[PDB]
Amino acid sequence: KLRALKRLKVVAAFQQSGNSPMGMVLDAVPVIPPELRPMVQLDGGRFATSDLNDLYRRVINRNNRLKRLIDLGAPEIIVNNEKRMLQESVDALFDNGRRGRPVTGPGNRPLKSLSDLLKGKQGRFRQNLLGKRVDYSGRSVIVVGPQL
Amino acid sequence: SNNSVPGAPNRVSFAKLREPLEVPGLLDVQTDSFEWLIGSPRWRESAAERGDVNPVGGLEEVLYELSPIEDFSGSMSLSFSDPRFDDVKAPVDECKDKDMTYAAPLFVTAEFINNNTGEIKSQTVFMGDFPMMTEKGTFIINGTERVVVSQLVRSPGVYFDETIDKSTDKTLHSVKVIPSRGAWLEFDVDKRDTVGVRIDRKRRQPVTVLLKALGWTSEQIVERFGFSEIMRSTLEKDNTVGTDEALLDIYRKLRPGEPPTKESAQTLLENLFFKEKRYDLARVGRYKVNKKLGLHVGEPITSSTLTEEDVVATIEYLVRLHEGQTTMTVPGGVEVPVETDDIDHFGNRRLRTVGELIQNQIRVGMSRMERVVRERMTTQDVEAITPQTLINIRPVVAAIKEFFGTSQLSQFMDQNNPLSGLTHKRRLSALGPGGLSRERAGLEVRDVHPSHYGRMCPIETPEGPNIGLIGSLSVYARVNPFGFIETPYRKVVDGVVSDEIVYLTADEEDRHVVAQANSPIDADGRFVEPRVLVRRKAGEVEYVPSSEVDYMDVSPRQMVSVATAMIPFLEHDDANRALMGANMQRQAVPLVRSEAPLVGTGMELRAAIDAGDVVVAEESGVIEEVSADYITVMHDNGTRRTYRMRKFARSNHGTCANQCPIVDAGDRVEAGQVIADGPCTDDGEMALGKNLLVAIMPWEGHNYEDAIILSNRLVEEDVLTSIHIEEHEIDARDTKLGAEEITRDIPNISDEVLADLDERGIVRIGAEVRDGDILVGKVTPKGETREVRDTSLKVPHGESGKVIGIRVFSREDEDELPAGVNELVRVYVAQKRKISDGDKLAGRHGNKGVIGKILPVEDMPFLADGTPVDIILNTHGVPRRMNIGQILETHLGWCAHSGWKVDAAKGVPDWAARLPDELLEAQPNAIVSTPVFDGAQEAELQGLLSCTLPNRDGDVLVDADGKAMLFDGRSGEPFPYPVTVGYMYIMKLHHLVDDKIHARSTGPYSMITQQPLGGKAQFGGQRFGEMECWAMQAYGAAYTLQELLTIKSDDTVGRVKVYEAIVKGENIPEPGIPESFKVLLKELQSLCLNVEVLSS
Amino acid sequence: NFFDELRIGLATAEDIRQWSYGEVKKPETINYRTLKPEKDGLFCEKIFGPTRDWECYCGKYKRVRFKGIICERCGVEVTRAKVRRERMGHIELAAPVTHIWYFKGVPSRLGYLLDLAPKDLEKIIYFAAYVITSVD
Amino acid sequence: PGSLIDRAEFEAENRRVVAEGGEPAAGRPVLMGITKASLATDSWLSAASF
Amino acid sequence: IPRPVKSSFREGLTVLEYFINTHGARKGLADTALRTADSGYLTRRLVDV
Amino acid sequence: VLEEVIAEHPVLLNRAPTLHRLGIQAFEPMLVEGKAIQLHPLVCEAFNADFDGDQMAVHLPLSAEAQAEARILMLSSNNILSPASGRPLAMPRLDMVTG
DNA sequence: ATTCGCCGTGTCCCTCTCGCTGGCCTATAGGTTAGACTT
RNA sequence: AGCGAG
DNA sequence: AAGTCTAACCTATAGGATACTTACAGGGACACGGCGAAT
Ligand SMILES: [Zn+2]
């Protein structure tokens, strides 16, 4: 009964509403615009991008290689391997660490993925929406002002 | 006493007991360990004194362990030997100036040998520029100064821990074997009588499989154990038969997916545990397990890896512990008690010092070296290779370069004092690589385990999120070669306290029975009181018969670090206030006088001398030439030496590092004498602050809730004033559009602003500069849209002062610079920052407070003869803070300032009976000392106060109670009741307001989100976080919140429009939609979540 | 400001290509020397927008009067520099891929919808076992 | 059956279903925890940010 | 600790008694440090409910 | 001119952590010499502040609606009672009690 | 052997805020691009 | 990585 | 000065032939799965 109730919730979510489940499997993946994905030189003119560029680049690399491979015509083993690579890379892109291994850039640091910008404190919600730095402001140490 | 320092001031002491051992070389923990790493001859001599059997340094160790490298074939081999160090390439000062890393080239004899035919190839290979510890124990990396903080870790070994399960209320004992870079392995005894074999943390296994895997037959197991019910139960219920079957099961479990085979199984087991390639529990670990199990006699240790006998010893010990035997007598080994070790205890928590840390880094670098060379031998043909070809330094040096920079222990040297520098050394950092972290650090690992007594500072720890994780070494503490922290002890042998200072570890100290440091020794080594306070094995404190005692502490204050040991009257301060005071003694800024404290302890001298600031006579001699720049001394035999002085050198935290000579041309200097003062020293003693005349009354509320009132005298006379030196640097680079060049030819600008610049375009030395002024003119190739725009280094907002000095580096001078940098300029601007209201002051008792108001000298309380009080403290902070030690401090300080004379009309007063001679009389301003835990008793202090010599006339300002009659300087009538006045030592803390204040009206904005930046280094705002937003919602203030989150910070169109409205005076427009919300929307959309908006 | 609803929901591939102003093909970010975004790269101006206000790749358009016009040789729409912050890209996958959240998040919504199990789904999607689409 | 629904809409649904075929759903009060109460809200922004 | 301390801060604690008092001081500080975070989280949950 | 354009222009004083509603209070600013925000001692208990190095933040409300909110809703003198239980917070404490 | 009811174990999201300081080797066709004269 | 306020 | 007119440079593609074959905390909570009575 309990399993039926849970699965009924999941399916009736689609059934009652007009949202069909076909949108769960992705044929095209969106690309967050560039300024939310910076690429800026700094210090001695050394360019310093973000981590999403690496993840997007990995997805693109896997995709181009897969397209070529299908076009040339290869045994099912290699095309399956490339599809698996694309899958795990899209997973890392959308959510790094959620599956497989955390894709770690140089220094064995898990690269920030699009999901990471939501979870925890450092995410968007708790850091830049529910509290923001403000102009026309200042601070200093305080002292007792008894003549006030 | 004598002080044993050829130039120390005759600071009298209240000490009622003698110190059998003078304080060690407080920087011993660093210098001795690093010299062990290097293998210096002095370390060799010390080892010969203390273990001549096995004298071998750290580098020799890592080389021997690595060597001989062998390929899989084994037809050729490689080896290393004889690590030698050359002289340092550049002197310490030179490297600090020109950014060079003070280091020595390292050379090693590499030997490549062919085994198939027999050949040798000997070479002297260059293994990098090994950084070298300076004389003061600080490394110099890239000019900067850094300190490697000693780390604390859990010693590799065997740990039997017992836990009570609530499911059935039963005690189960589990062992845990910690190797150094090995594989984990646990034995558990669960609810049932099943002995676990969890290997690599995998789903539990029975015991019989492992024993059979090791070749132990069922008959062998049964006959070796004919008593233990649990294990016969396990044998019957193991439901597995055959060593081959056991290996099959082990391989299947440990190697899922692999087709099992018996030879592979045995080889894999041996490789995983017994072969010395992946299981290398270090010499410390082997020592620990041998002691815990008593397998071997105290023979030299070379079989670091584990052994079958060892694991069977652990199994039998564990099962017998479950049975509950008192002691275990292992087969063919020394018997030892059956006890459960505790992780926090210092008998099992080792001090991994600088030597071991750099050794580990070298070991990993050399391991990667070994990997790459073993790879190389396959590609290269034999007979066509030379040790030069085999060795590629890139791993090793990288490790070193990656360790000193960018590490959790190569901490940036913090020196705004000498004490801060000293105490940064001798610091035990429980957190770091291979250690615990803040998230996993519970309350259990942070407490003060009763074994800390003498091996750590129970009082001195940070207050932030590090309480107990970062302690300091005790004064007398010493480090065993194994990394344990020894403490000295005096051995009493049947009521005769002897003089053999024997160093004990935690375990040995627990074995014996140790008495307190202060006890009634009857001038002959015997005790008076029948029973004395005494420590037992687990830290318990009791009374024990006097004849039983066999160990006594060397002296009280053995259980306090350098910092805490300088707090006079520490025996009256609650531990929290003492903790805070010991913390802030590391924060006091160095003033321009630095008067010696009027009341202190014995540590004011040694600390200073060990800090290394004061120039010390290398050899005894006669002074010849004295000058502010340098001192030249005639040595006793012909030769001479010149000591060059660092004047106005910047400190790592912006304070000045002046050194001032204190000798004249004719003086004879003895070896080890103090020749020149440091930043905070005064004739050798540590002078962190000033003796100020303090009253303890609440004065008109200005000293309300910890606030401190100051006399304007301290500003007029310049009692408190620091010289904060800053460092501003700019570099001209080469770009595609052209080459940057600093010069006076700035773009359109008035002639009023080039006055300061000299012909080079940089500010003339000595020219005052203020906010908005130009330091180094610079014009940046403008290219396509003058051929150059404006990019001159302007001093940041709020800064000012004189230009101390200008340093220049030019490509034409063939000087080292980053690629593309035509020139580099460093400008020093120094400000003589005065004392200002809002700044923090504090004593040596954590009696902190800001300067609420600096009254004029006239309208302050004054004594009978018109002496204004230089400071006032609130009275409602002494009692509840439980730090009345400061009150006794200021009482003794008044007694020291005025001078006293005990009248021996009828013998000597009884209260002064214990008082030593030379304290019955003392001239005014006679500096004294009250050691930490034995010192000026209350009765002695009262008696001292009862007879103080009149200052000028027949008038004793302070009565016997320590309280005087203060005349209100604001109104004139006397305060109707007395006031507690005295001389208290207080210091200026490095929290000055000029570095704190900040405002913003429109500054830089981030680019991912258009919110304002954050930080004083930029303009930045102030984070209106979430709790503030809850406050605003609670008030109901909606428009204020809206504009605090929309137009002030985020609405990209809103900011310019509201600024325009304010400037032109129109109404403030309506806020829009936060940009950061748009960014959230775009991110969600880029996450394939169709998040749409509509209002209809 | 006229807000009433945030009706989040599953985004079908049709919507993904509906948002996209172009399609990034190659993983090329910025030129080695001239420091300019490539064509059909992850930053290509034609896809997202001009990196400089009132300019285009070949640069023949610089005035503001002909705003809202896309060049010929390089095909960059002449708009504000800030429009890059909003215009969004997309990439066409050669083979379909599963959204990580719905597949792996516990409980697996995909598995519950399709009556399948978590480890089983991990096996099929990551190419470890086959599944029958249908049979007559 | 067993899904948590706020009291007001529960009563409204009971009243509505009583009309046009009476099958009045009979529920029972439940004591939720604070965190679950925060999550089981009618707005997904607050729950998302919580 | 069943000793217990018998010396007043005015009279001046001996060495072992100070070492004993240190346990209480340190545990109080650590408890405060952690309880502040626990209180903050509870406050956030209450505000959100 | 500054001394004139500041009169009757409230500013919000805040002290992190803002544990309760009283953490933020609007005060009329008056010019002071030195470098430290002078704080009326009575409000200390509201802020939980003790002058031992505490730092506090000043925010400026701009819009006429915001300035009205500062003057009426959040002014210091309009908030003498704790929202918790009505116990006054801006009452003589510590030194004043002894006096 | 399946049903249903219990236990049992494994894998995962959360525990205050606000400041400050420092730190390989070519070969070739086609695309692309530098410089210069001019009316 | 270190530190200040609670 | 853009509009030609002239003269380079630079880079995606491609091409060369001993041999070499398996890397490198803790806590609460829920969901996926042991152990036992019943049909
Ligand atoms: Zn164009």
Short mmCIF file of N, CA, C and O in Angstrom, two decimals, chain A residues 6-7 10-11 14 21 23-31 33-37 39 47 53 57 59-61 63-64 66-67 80 83-84 86-87 90-91 94-95 98-99, chain C residues 10-11 13 16 25 27 30 35 42-43 48 84-105 109-110 112-113 115 122 125-127:
data_model
loop_
_atom_site.label_atom_id
_atom_site.label_comp_id
_atom_site.label_asym_id
_atom_site.label_seq_id
_atom_site.Cartn_x
_atom_site.Cartn_y
_atom_site.Cartn_z
N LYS A 6 3.17 6.11 -2.77
CA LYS A 6 4.28 6.95 -3.21
C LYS A 6 4.33 7.03 -4.73
O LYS A 6 4.44 8.12 -5.32
N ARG A 7 4.26 5.88 -5.40
CA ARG A 7 4.31 5.89 -6.86
C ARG A 7 3.10 6.59 -7.45
O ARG A 7 3.22 7.24 -8.50
N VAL A 10 3.86 10.22 -7.39
CA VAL A 10 4.81 10.60 -8.43
C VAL A 10 4.11 10.69 -9.79
O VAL A 10 4.29 11.66 -10.53
N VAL A 11 3.31 9.68 -10.13
CA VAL A 11 2.69 9.65 -11.45
C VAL A 11 1.55 10.66 -11.56
O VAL A 11 1.41 11.34 -12.58
N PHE A 14 2.26 14.17 -12.72
CA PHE A 14 2.17 14.39 -14.16
C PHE A 14 0.74 14.31 -14.65
O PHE A 14 0.30 15.13 -15.47
N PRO A 21 5.72 13.78 -18.86
CA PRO A 21 7.06 13.43 -18.37
C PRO A 21 8.13 13.38 -19.44
O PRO A 21 9.31 13.21 -19.11
N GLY A 23 9.60 15.60 -20.87
CA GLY A 23 10.61 16.60 -20.62
C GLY A 23 11.70 16.18 -19.66
O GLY A 23 12.62 16.97 -19.42
N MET A 24 11.63 14.97 -19.11
CA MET A 24 12.66 14.53 -18.18
C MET A 24 13.93 14.10 -18.90
O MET A 24 15.03 14.28 -18.36
N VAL A 25 13.81 13.53 -20.10
CA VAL A 25 14.96 13.07 -20.88
C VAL A 25 15.32 14.16 -21.88
O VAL A 25 14.47 14.62 -22.64
N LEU A 26 16.59 14.55 -21.88
CA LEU A 26 17.03 15.77 -22.56
C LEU A 26 17.67 15.43 -23.90
O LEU A 26 18.57 14.59 -23.97
N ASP A 27 17.21 16.10 -24.95
CA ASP A 27 17.86 16.06 -26.25
C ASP A 27 18.77 17.25 -26.48
O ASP A 27 19.76 17.13 -27.21
N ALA A 28 18.45 18.40 -25.88
CA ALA A 28 19.26 19.60 -25.97
C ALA A 28 19.46 20.17 -24.58
O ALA A 28 18.53 20.18 -23.77
N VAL A 29 20.67 20.64 -24.31
CA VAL A 29 21.03 21.15 -22.99
C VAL A 29 21.26 22.66 -23.09
O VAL A 29 21.93 23.10 -24.03
N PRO A 30 20.75 23.48 -22.17
CA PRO A 30 20.94 24.92 -22.28
C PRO A 30 22.27 25.38 -21.71
O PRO A 30 22.88 24.72 -20.86
N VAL A 31 22.70 26.55 -22.18
CA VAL A 31 23.99 27.12 -21.85
C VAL A 31 23.73 28.44 -21.16
O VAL A 31 23.21 29.38 -21.78
N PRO A 33 24.20 32.12 -19.87
CA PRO A 33 24.87 33.15 -20.66
C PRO A 33 26.29 33.40 -20.18
O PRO A 33 26.70 32.88 -19.13
N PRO A 34 27.06 34.20 -20.92
CA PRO A 34 28.50 34.31 -20.59
C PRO A 34 28.80 35.05 -19.30
O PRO A 34 29.72 34.65 -18.58
N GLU A 35 28.06 36.11 -18.98
CA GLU A 35 28.45 36.95 -17.85
C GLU A 35 28.15 36.27 -16.53
O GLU A 35 28.80 36.56 -15.52
N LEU A 36 27.16 35.37 -16.51
CA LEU A 36 27.00 34.46 -15.39
C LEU A 36 28.04 33.35 -15.41
O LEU A 36 28.10 32.55 -14.47
N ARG A 37 28.86 33.31 -16.46
CA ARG A 37 29.91 32.30 -16.61
C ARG A 37 31.25 32.97 -16.93
O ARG A 37 31.89 32.67 -17.94
N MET A 39 34.69 35.13 -17.90
CA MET A 39 36.00 34.87 -18.51
C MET A 39 36.70 36.23 -18.56
O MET A 39 36.50 37.01 -19.49
N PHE A 47 44.06 35.31 -17.73
CA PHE A 47 42.64 35.03 -17.75
C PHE A 47 42.27 34.03 -16.67
O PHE A 47 43.01 33.10 -16.38
N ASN A 53 32.87 26.61 -17.32
CA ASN A 53 33.46 26.52 -18.65
C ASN A 53 34.08 25.14 -18.87
O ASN A 53 33.92 24.56 -19.94
N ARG A 57 32.67 22.58 -21.53
CA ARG A 57 33.65 22.16 -22.52
C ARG A 57 33.73 20.64 -22.60
O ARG A 57 33.88 20.07 -23.67
N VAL A 59 31.30 18.54 -21.86
CA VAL A 59 30.08 18.10 -22.54
C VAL A 59 30.22 18.30 -24.04
O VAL A 59 29.87 17.43 -24.84
N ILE A 60 30.74 19.46 -24.45
CA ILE A 60 30.90 19.76 -25.87
C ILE A 60 31.87 18.78 -26.51
O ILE A 60 31.64 18.29 -27.62
N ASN A 61 32.99 18.52 -25.84
CA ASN A 61 33.99 17.60 -26.37
C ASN A 61 33.38 16.23 -26.58
O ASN A 61 33.50 15.63 -27.66
N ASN A 63 30.29 15.51 -26.94
CA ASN A 63 29.26 15.60 -27.97
C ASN A 63 29.85 15.57 -29.37
O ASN A 63 29.37 14.85 -30.25
N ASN A 64 30.87 16.40 -29.61
CA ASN A 64 31.49 16.42 -30.94
C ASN A 64 32.09 15.07 -31.27
O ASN A 64 31.92 14.55 -32.38
N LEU A 66 31.21 12.17 -30.14
CA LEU A 66 30.13 11.22 -30.36
C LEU A 66 29.50 11.42 -31.74
O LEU A 66 29.22 10.44 -32.45
N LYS A 67 29.26 12.67 -32.13
CA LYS A 67 28.71 12.94 -33.45
C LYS A 67 29.61 12.38 -34.54
O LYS A 67 29.16 11.65 -35.43
N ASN A 80 28.72 3.16 -27.32
CA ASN A 80 28.18 3.06 -25.98
C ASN A 80 29.08 3.75 -24.98
O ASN A 80 28.61 4.44 -24.07
N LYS A 83 28.61 7.50 -25.32
CA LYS A 83 27.33 7.90 -24.76
C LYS A 83 27.38 7.90 -23.24
O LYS A 83 26.84 8.81 -22.59
N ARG A 84 28.03 6.90 -22.65
CA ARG A 84 28.20 6.87 -21.20
C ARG A 84 29.00 8.07 -20.72
O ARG A 84 28.69 8.68 -19.69
N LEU A 86 29.26 11.03 -22.22
CA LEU A 86 28.39 12.20 -22.32
C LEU A 86 27.39 12.23 -21.17
O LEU A 86 27.10 13.29 -20.63
N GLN A 87 26.87 11.06 -20.79
CA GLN A 87 25.90 11.01 -19.71
C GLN A 87 26.52 11.47 -18.40
O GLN A 87 25.99 12.36 -17.72
N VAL A 90 27.25 15.25 -18.53
CA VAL A 90 26.07 16.09 -18.34
C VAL A 90 25.63 16.04 -16.88
O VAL A 90 25.15 17.03 -16.33
N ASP A 91 25.79 14.88 -16.24
CA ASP A 91 25.48 14.78 -14.82
C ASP A 91 26.40 15.68 -13.99
O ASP A 91 25.93 16.42 -13.12
N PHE A 94 25.35 19.38 -14.67
CA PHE A 94 24.14 19.76 -13.96
C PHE A 94 24.29 19.63 -12.47
O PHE A 94 23.75 20.45 -11.72
N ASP A 95 25.01 18.61 -12.01
CA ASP A 95 25.18 18.38 -10.59
C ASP A 95 26.45 17.58 -10.36
O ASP A 95 26.45 16.35 -10.51
N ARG A 98 27.00 14.37 -7.60
CA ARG A 98 25.76 13.63 -7.38
C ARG A 98 25.88 12.19 -7.84
O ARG A 98 25.21 11.31 -7.30
N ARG A 99 26.73 11.93 -8.84
CA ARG A 99 26.91 10.59 -9.37
C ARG A 99 28.37 10.39 -9.73
O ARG A 99 29.13 11.35 -9.91
N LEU C 10 8.84 21.13 -15.75
CA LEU C 10 9.80 20.48 -16.62
C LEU C 10 9.92 21.23 -17.94
O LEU C 10 8.92 21.66 -18.52
N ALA C 11 11.15 21.38 -18.41
CA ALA C 11 11.44 22.09 -19.65
C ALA C 11 11.77 21.05 -20.72
O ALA C 11 12.81 20.40 -20.67
N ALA C 13 12.79 19.70 -24.51
CA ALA C 13 13.84 20.13 -25.43
C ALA C 13 13.35 21.22 -26.37
O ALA C 13 14.13 22.11 -26.75
N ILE C 16 13.87 24.33 -24.69
CA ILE C 16 15.29 24.63 -24.56
C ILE C 16 15.80 25.29 -25.83
O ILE C 16 16.53 26.29 -25.78
N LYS C 25 28.54 25.46 -31.04
CA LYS C 25 29.03 24.22 -31.64
C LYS C 25 30.35 23.78 -31.03
O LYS C 25 30.45 22.68 -30.46
N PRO C 27 34.02 24.09 -28.65
CA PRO C 27 34.38 24.50 -27.29
C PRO C 27 35.46 25.58 -27.25
O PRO C 27 36.42 25.51 -26.48
N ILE C 30 38.06 32.00 -26.30
CA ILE C 30 38.69 33.27 -26.63
C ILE C 30 39.92 33.00 -27.48
O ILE C 30 40.62 32.00 -27.28
N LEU C 35 42.32 38.22 -28.23
CA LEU C 35 41.46 38.19 -27.06
C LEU C 35 40.00 38.44 -27.44
O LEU C 35 39.27 39.17 -26.77
N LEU C 42 31.80 29.03 -27.19
CA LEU C 42 31.04 29.18 -25.95
C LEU C 42 30.77 30.64 -25.60
O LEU C 42 30.02 30.89 -24.66
N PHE C 43 31.38 31.59 -26.32
CA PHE C 43 31.17 33.01 -26.07
C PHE C 43 30.76 33.76 -27.33
O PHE C 43 30.69 34.99 -27.30
N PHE C 48 25.24 34.87 -28.10
CA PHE C 48 24.83 35.55 -26.88
C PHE C 48 24.66 37.05 -27.11
O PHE C 48 23.60 37.60 -26.81
N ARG C 84 24.22 40.39 -23.24
CA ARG C 84 24.82 39.07 -23.08
C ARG C 84 24.41 38.44 -21.76
O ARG C 84 24.35 37.21 -21.65
N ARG C 85 24.13 39.26 -20.74
CA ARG C 85 23.75 38.73 -19.44
C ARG C 85 22.45 37.93 -19.50
O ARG C 85 22.21 37.10 -18.61
N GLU C 86 21.63 38.14 -20.52
CA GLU C 86 20.29 37.57 -20.59
C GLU C 86 20.15 36.51 -21.67
O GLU C 86 19.62 35.43 -21.41
N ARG C 87 20.62 36.78 -22.88
CA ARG C 87 20.48 35.82 -23.96
C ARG C 87 21.20 34.53 -23.61
O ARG C 87 22.33 34.55 -23.11
N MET C 88 20.54 33.40 -23.86
CA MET C 88 20.97 32.10 -23.39
C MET C 88 21.25 31.19 -24.58
O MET C 88 20.60 31.30 -25.63
N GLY C 89 22.23 30.30 -24.43
CA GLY C 89 22.62 29.40 -25.48
C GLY C 89 22.03 28.01 -25.29
O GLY C 89 21.30 27.72 -24.35
N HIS C 90 22.39 27.11 -26.22
CA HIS C 90 22.01 25.72 -26.08
C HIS C 90 22.92 24.86 -26.94
O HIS C 90 23.64 25.35 -27.81
N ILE C 91 22.88 23.56 -26.67
CA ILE C 91 23.71 22.57 -27.35
C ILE C 91 22.84 21.37 -27.68
O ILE C 91 22.06 20.91 -26.84
N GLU C 92 22.98 20.86 -28.90
CA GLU C 92 22.21 19.70 -29.35
C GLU C 92 23.01 18.44 -29.07
O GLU C 92 24.14 18.30 -29.55
N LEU C 93 22.43 17.52 -28.31
CA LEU C 93 23.10 16.27 -27.98
C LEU C 93 22.90 15.27 -29.12
O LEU C 93 21.79 15.11 -29.63
N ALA C 94 23.99 14.60 -29.50
CA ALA C 94 23.89 13.57 -30.53
C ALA C 94 22.96 12.46 -30.08
O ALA C 94 22.14 11.96 -30.86
N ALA C 95 23.08 12.05 -28.82
CA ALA C 95 22.21 11.05 -28.22
C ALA C 95 21.55 11.64 -26.98
O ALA C 95 22.15 12.47 -26.29
N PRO C 96 20.32 11.23 -26.67
CA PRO C 96 19.63 11.82 -25.52
C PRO C 96 20.35 11.49 -24.22
O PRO C 96 21.07 10.50 -24.11
N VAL C 97 20.15 12.36 -23.24
CA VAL C 97 20.77 12.23 -21.93
C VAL C 97 19.72 12.48 -20.87
O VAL C 97 18.76 13.24 -21.08
N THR C 98 19.89 11.86 -19.70
CA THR C 98 18.91 11.96 -18.63
C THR C 98 19.33 13.03 -17.63
O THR C 98 20.50 13.15 -17.27
N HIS C 99 18.35 13.83 -17.22
CA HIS C 99 18.57 14.80 -16.16
C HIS C 99 18.99 14.09 -14.89
O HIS C 99 18.34 13.13 -14.46
N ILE C 100 20.08 14.56 -14.28
CA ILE C 100 20.64 13.85 -13.13
C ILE C 100 19.67 13.87 -11.95
O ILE C 100 19.54 12.89 -11.22
N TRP C 101 19.00 15.01 -11.74
CA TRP C 101 18.16 15.17 -10.56
C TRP C 101 17.08 14.11 -10.49
O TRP C 101 16.97 13.36 -9.51
N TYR C 102 16.25 14.02 -11.53
CA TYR C 102 15.12 13.10 -11.48
C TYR C 102 15.58 11.66 -11.45
O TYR C 102 14.91 10.80 -10.87
N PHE C 103 16.72 11.36 -12.07
CA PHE C 103 17.21 9.99 -12.10
C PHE C 103 17.73 9.55 -10.74
O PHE C 103 17.39 8.47 -10.25
N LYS C 104 18.56 10.38 -10.11
CA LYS C 104 19.35 9.94 -8.96
C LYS C 104 18.79 10.41 -7.62
O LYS C 104 18.97 9.71 -6.62
N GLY C 105 18.11 11.55 -7.58
CA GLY C 105 17.58 12.05 -6.32
C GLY C 105 16.66 11.05 -5.65
O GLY C 105 15.79 10.47 -6.30
N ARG C 109 12.47 9.65 -8.91
CA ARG C 109 11.18 9.93 -9.53
C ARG C 109 11.03 9.17 -10.84
O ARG C 109 9.94 8.67 -11.15
N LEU C 110 12.10 9.08 -11.62
CA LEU C 110 12.05 8.31 -12.85
C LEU C 110 11.70 6.85 -12.57
O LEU C 110 10.81 6.28 -13.22
N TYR C 112 10.18 5.53 -9.91
CA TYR C 112 8.82 5.41 -9.42
C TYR C 112 7.82 5.56 -10.56
O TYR C 112 6.83 4.81 -10.63
N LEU C 113 8.05 6.51 -11.47
CA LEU C 113 7.15 6.69 -12.60
C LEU C 113 7.13 5.45 -13.49
O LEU C 113 6.07 5.00 -13.93
N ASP C 115 8.15 2.40 -12.60
CA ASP C 115 8.02 1.19 -11.79
C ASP C 115 9.38 0.50 -11.59
O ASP C 115 9.46 -0.55 -10.95
N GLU C 122 20.25 2.82 -12.73
CA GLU C 122 21.68 3.08 -12.89
C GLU C 122 22.28 2.14 -13.92
O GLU C 122 23.13 2.55 -14.73
N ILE C 125 20.69 3.06 -17.74
CA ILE C 125 20.99 4.35 -18.36
C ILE C 125 22.49 4.47 -18.65
O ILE C 125 22.89 4.97 -19.70
N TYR C 126 23.33 4.01 -17.72
CA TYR C 126 24.77 4.11 -17.88
C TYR C 126 25.36 2.97 -18.70
O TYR C 126 26.56 2.69 -18.59
N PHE C 127 24.54 2.30 -19.51
CA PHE C 127 25.02 1.29 -20.44
C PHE C 127 25.69 0.13 -19.69
O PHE C 127 26.88 -0.15 -19.84
#
